[PDB]
């Protein structure tokens, strides 16, 4: 059995989210198919050599990633589809049996047979039972879950004859994301995929997580005869053939019209033409060069390893404590060696303010802060807004005096039902008579009075002196300003030390020789995380380099000198002549050795290794690196596209182009030298 390979132009597009958008180009990093890749071309033959002998190309294809299963059927060739995990009756199964008025999905662990045939011939008066024949199964077990979906997830139109359908699958643990559509080609050419753009929308999702490692195709026999030329052959000789693809986690681009339809699709890791469309949110690239990324991408799973801690932070003992204190001796309690869970905080009260100066509350959940302090106090209602960076000293800002560079939140809420009393309201006080402005995070517990110039007041107020710590009077007979408000000012600290307070993120495994996403102890990187031999201090983390780019970070659990080298060469420019002129790009390398590309060593579209090639696309060495994709001529022109080191690029036809002659030249890429005249 010999199989061929066919390419895809622009098909296999799928909506990533489940919402509608209008004039919004969203960029996401998920799993989707790649055009211009090889697809298997299993040619299915329908023949019979006996009553029990059936010949059909039913091979156990291995879906390391999800694959496209086309539906190029005439009437009823493909009706179902099998999915196995081990083919040994050890994992849950799934069947998409979408037949006439019967769309029952069975997910029972069964070991039926090795080859599954399908016919539409009633065995013995099968009009009373279901239309699905009982020759598919051989036993029965405990039924876990079933589906009684009424709508048919199968497009069948026996009038057109051609079936250019697109179907994809998603093997996620959350849902299945079954996307099925159907189109029709206007030309009766061979069984090839037509060119053009197309998108798929989800129809039915399955919340059952099943480990899928083996895939099998299902075909309907529909022979009913043994000799060619009958009412089922010759006139309807429609032995079909289907293709299978594979997924690779890359970055995709999608556009949404005013109605919500996708027009085009751009993959960053296909050609240097499309690399400029991802780094810059645009589809009409201008003439010149741009700074983009190489063909490398991110893998399926990321690494988010955090320090080994299993203790919960005592945030409950902070917010809903029994009794608070006046703001001259605010209760500041540090939190360390625990796991931060910023979810029980919202379960306390309808907070009037949640101003998080510094770290945004979105990323505040997972950053692995060094230490966390919890300052709790009761301030006046209309004076809560003064507890913030800035806010020049008011009558209450001389007690806390938040600094100008704060990296925490300010949670506050009214407590009139726990603090206000008819008589007992003098327990809460505030400092009013101060000498100088306090320092950030500095308390000034004191009972000495302020001398009023004339005579030194020695513990007695008398004529003009006044005792400090005046009462607030938080009685339940005021408005919304003169009410007690319990404020919890969480302050996060980030110093060079092993982190002790992290978010609720699990710890993954270590994958060295792979370009996985770097998320160690809050640091975000996208380089090669492998073993190195750098020199680090014993208790020092988050190492840096001569530049501000993070070069190495020690693992939080098992100390390890692991450096972060970039997955791309970085200095890989892209010469774009414009999406409205041509589609030729000369790749520029900024001071690098011979082309390696560790990720795409032998990709489909490889610009180097084109020494013996005509009409442009040649390799040359420059002072700023290597020039691949153009030619060199001893002529000179203006600054059309600057390459560097006195060399520039220009998109001209050729040096020999006469409009009155019969010799018409191409429009390849040619590079010239710069002249001063």
């Amino acid at each position, epitope marked *: 059995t010999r199989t061929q390979s066919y390419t895809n132009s622009f098909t296999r597009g799928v909506y990533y989210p489940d919402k509608v958008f209008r004039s919004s180009v969203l960029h996401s990093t998920q799993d989707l198919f790649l055009p211009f890749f090889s697809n298997v071309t299993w040619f299915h033959a329908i023949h019979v050599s006996g009553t029990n002998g059936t010949k059909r190309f039913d091979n156990p294809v291995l879906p390391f990633n999800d694959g496209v299963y086309f539906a190029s059927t005439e009437k009823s060739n493909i009706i179902r589809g099998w999915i196995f995990g081990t083919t040994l009756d050890s994992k849950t199964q799934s069947l998409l049996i979408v037949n006439n008025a019967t769309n029952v999905v069975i997910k029972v662990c069964e070991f039926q047979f090795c080859n599954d045939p399908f016919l539409d011939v009633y065995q013995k008066n099968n009009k009373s039972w279901m239309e699905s024949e009982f020759r598919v199964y051989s036993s029965a077990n405990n039924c876990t879950f079933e589906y009684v979906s009424q709508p048919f997830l199968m497009d069948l139109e026996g009038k057109e004859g051609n079936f250019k359908n697109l179907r994809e699958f998603v093997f996620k643990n959350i849902d299945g994301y079954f996307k099925i559509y159907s189109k029709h080609t206007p030309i009766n050419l061979e069984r090839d995929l037509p060119q053009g753009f197309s998108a798929l929308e989800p129809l039915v999702d399955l919340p059952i997580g099943i480990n899928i490692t083996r895939f099998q195709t299902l075909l309907a026999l529909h022979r009913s005869y043994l000799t060619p030329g009958d009412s089922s052959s010759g006139w309807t000789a429609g032995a079909a053939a289907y293709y299978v693809g594979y997924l690779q986690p890359r970055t995709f681009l999608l556009k949404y019209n005013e109605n919500g339809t996708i027009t085009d699709a751009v993959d960053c890791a296909l050609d240097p033409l499309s690399e400029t469309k991802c780094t810059l949110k645009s589809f009409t690239v201008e003439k010149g060069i741009y700074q983009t990324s190489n063909f490398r991408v991110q893998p399926t799973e990321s690494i988010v390893r955090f320090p080994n801690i299993t203790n919960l932070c005592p945030f409950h003992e902070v917010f809903n404590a029994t009794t608070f204190a006046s703001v001259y001796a605010w209760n500041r309690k540090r939190i360390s060696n*625990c796991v931060a869970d910023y979810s029980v905080i919202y379960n306390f009260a309808p907070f009037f303010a949640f101003k998080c100066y510094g770290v945004s509350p979105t990323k505040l959940n997972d950053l692995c802060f060094t230490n966390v302090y919890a300052d709790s106090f009761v301030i006046r209602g209309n004076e809560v807004s003064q507890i913030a960076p800035g806010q020049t000293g008011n009558i209450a800002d001389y007690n806390y005096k938040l600094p100008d560079d704060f990296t925490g939140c300010v949670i506050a809420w009214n407590s009139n039902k726990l603090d206000s009393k008819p008589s007992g309201n003098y327990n809460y006080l505030y400092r009013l008579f101060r000498k100088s402005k306090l320092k950030p995070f500095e308390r*000034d517990i004191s009972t000495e009075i302020y001398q009023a110039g004339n005579k030194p007041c020695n513990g007695v107020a008398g004529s003009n002196c006044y005792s400090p710590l005046q009462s607030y009077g938080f009685r339940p007979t005021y408005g919304v300003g003169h009410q007690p408000y319990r404020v919890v000012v969480l302050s996060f600290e980030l*110093l060079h030390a092993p982190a002790t307070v992290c978010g609720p993120k699990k710890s993954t495994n270590l994958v060295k020789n792979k370009c996985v996403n770097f998320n160690f102890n809050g640091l975000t990187g996208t380089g090669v995380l492998t073993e190195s031999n750098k020199k680090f201090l014993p208790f020092q983390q988050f190492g840096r380099d001569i530049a501000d780019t993070t070069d190495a970070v020690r693992d939080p659990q098992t100390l390890e000198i692991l450096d972060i080298t970039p997955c791309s060469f970085g200095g890989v420019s892209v010469i774009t002549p414009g999406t409205n002129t041509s589609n030729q790009v000369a790749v520029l390398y900024q001071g690098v050795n011979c082309t390696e590309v560790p990720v795409a060593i032998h990709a489909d579209q490889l610009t180097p290794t084109w020494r013996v090639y005509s009409t442009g696309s040649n390799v040359f060495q420059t002072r700023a690196g290597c020039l691949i994709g153009a030619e060199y001529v001893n002529n000179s022109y203006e600054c059309d596209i600057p390459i560097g080191a006195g060399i520039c690029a220009s998109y001209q036809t050729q040096t020999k182009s006469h409009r009155r002659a019969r010799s018409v030249a191409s429009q390849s890429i040619i590079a010239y030298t710069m002249s001063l005249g």
Partner: antibody
Amino acid sequence: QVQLQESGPGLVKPSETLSLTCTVSGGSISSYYWTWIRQPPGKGLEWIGYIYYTGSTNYNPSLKSRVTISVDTSKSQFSLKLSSVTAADTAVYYCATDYYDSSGYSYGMDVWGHGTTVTVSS
Amino acid sequence: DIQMTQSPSSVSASVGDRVTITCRASQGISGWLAWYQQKPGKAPKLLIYAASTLQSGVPSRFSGSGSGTDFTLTISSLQPEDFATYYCQQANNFPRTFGQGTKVEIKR
């Protein structure tokens, strides 16, 4: 949830050395000033000093040049080498966790140990 | 070196009374004091640090106050589970000294 388990001798001859071990279980050694504190029987509490993770020692002027506190960052341990032990050094030594924050706070002894009596006799 | 001195060496009272233990010093500590407790023979467990701020798991019966040189500790209700020797720890400079112990007794 940090704990401190003490371990050391119980009877030390005079003029010899004195060293015990407090293993840290509950967190890494990068926050507290894991050190010791002595308490003679029937008297008050006397301090020893504080040792940080970045090798920073500071003792009391009384017993300054008789103690050399060390820390083992590898196996998360720290010991107190007390030399020239005399009869006055009979005390119940405890392991405590002190910390003063950079802003200016002075959090007291949060986590304590259990106590290991060190009798000086022969 | 600051020498912490506690005036009441033994405050004998009954269940329901208020005990006021004082702690004076030579040099003036701004606001950083501490109160400990070790009833049978165990290690002194902290109750109120910074002389006003309670610790996680400390009953509301304990309450500290004072500033400068004079600091006090006010136990509202004398629960049977309060017999211990309370201490005062100066926490301003590097050498942290303690008090002299206050054997709080209960008169049944």
